[PDB]
């Protein structure tokens, strides 16, 4: 339970390039 980890994460600026998968990833259920 490293604080720096969780910190650095947000403290920085949640990557964006990942925003793609990170987000799109949500998908996973074809109609």
């Amino acid at each position: 339970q490293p604080q720096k980890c969780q910190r650095e994460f947000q403290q920085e600026q949640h990557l964006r390039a990942c925003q793609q998968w990170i987000r799109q990833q949500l998908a996973g259920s074809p109609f």
């Binding site: 490293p2 980890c5 969780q6 949640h14 990557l15 990942c18 925003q19 990170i22 949500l26």
Partner: protein, 75 residues
């Protein structure tokens, strides 16, 4: 990634963020992300528990399953 025919090294930028630091915050970097992702909002139901592990750098972020990977997030 329809009609694939290129191999950019931009994704690295994603890892570069984590890599630059201590891998110590690799899979644990995304995990926390999912925390936000999941949150119904636009994805009512989900598997924060599963989606967590399953996830995947992208894949791309870096390209090393020997380090770790998980679901990330953005601002």
């Amino acid at each position: 990634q329809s009609g694939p025919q290129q191999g950019p090294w931009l994704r690295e930028q994603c890892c570069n963020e984590l890599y630059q630091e201590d891998q110590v915050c690799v899979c644990p970097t995304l995990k926390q992300a999912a925390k936000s992702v999941r949150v119904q909002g636009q994805h009512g139901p989900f598997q924060s528990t599963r989606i967590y592990q399953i996830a995947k750098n992208l894949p791309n972020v870096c390209n090393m399953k020997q380090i770790g990977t998980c679901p990330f997030i953005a601002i």
